[PDB]
Design a protein around this ligand. Structure first.
Ligand SMILES: OC[C@H]1O[C@H](O)[C@@H](O)[C@@H](O)[C@@H]1O
Length: 141
């Protein structure tokens, strides 16, 4: 809807930064829609990924990083706070030791930094969703 998907935005992250994403799945969970959020080191899609967050609605969540063109140790979670056919609010906060992911205001996943957050230069949100809001908090030094 509001914003185009794939959605790409140049960004700068550091401790205290928050990325808020608002959207909804394009189809019911039965058809297994996906949602993917990648924090890139460069403005290009082929660049490395500091934090890869992929949701298979109703199934699982996978997190990883792509370093020097290679995927690393994948982390899998079965925690599924997302609701079928519902708008969701996803917020990713940058803590000193890791990323904390909140879904609709509830802590749901964390991922220890593998690469310093300062290496991020772009964020891309894509797959099967309509995007209504994308915001990066630049209120701290
Ligand atoms: O999430 C999908 C993507 O990240 C995983 O963590 C890795 O195993 C990659 O091989 C895979 O292509």
């Amino acid at each position: 809807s509001l914003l185009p998907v794939p959605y790409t935005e140049a960004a700068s992250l550091s401790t205290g930064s928050t990325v808020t994403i608002k959207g909804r799945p394009l189809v019911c969970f039965l058809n297994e829609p996906y949602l993917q959020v990648d924090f890139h080191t460069e403005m290009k899609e082929e660049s490395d990924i500091v934090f890869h967050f992929q949701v298979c609605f109703g199934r699982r969540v996978v997190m990883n990083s792509r370093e020097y063109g290679a995927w690393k140790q994948q982390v899998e979670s079965k925690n599924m706070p997302f609701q079928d056919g519902q708008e969701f609010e996803l917020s990713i906060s940058v803590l000193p030791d890791k990323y904390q992911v909140m879904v609709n205001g509830q802590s749901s996943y964390t991922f220890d930094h593998r690469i310093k957050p300062e290496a991020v230069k772009m964020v891309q949100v894509w797959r099967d969703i309509s995007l209504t809001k994308f915001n990066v908090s630049y209120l701290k030094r």
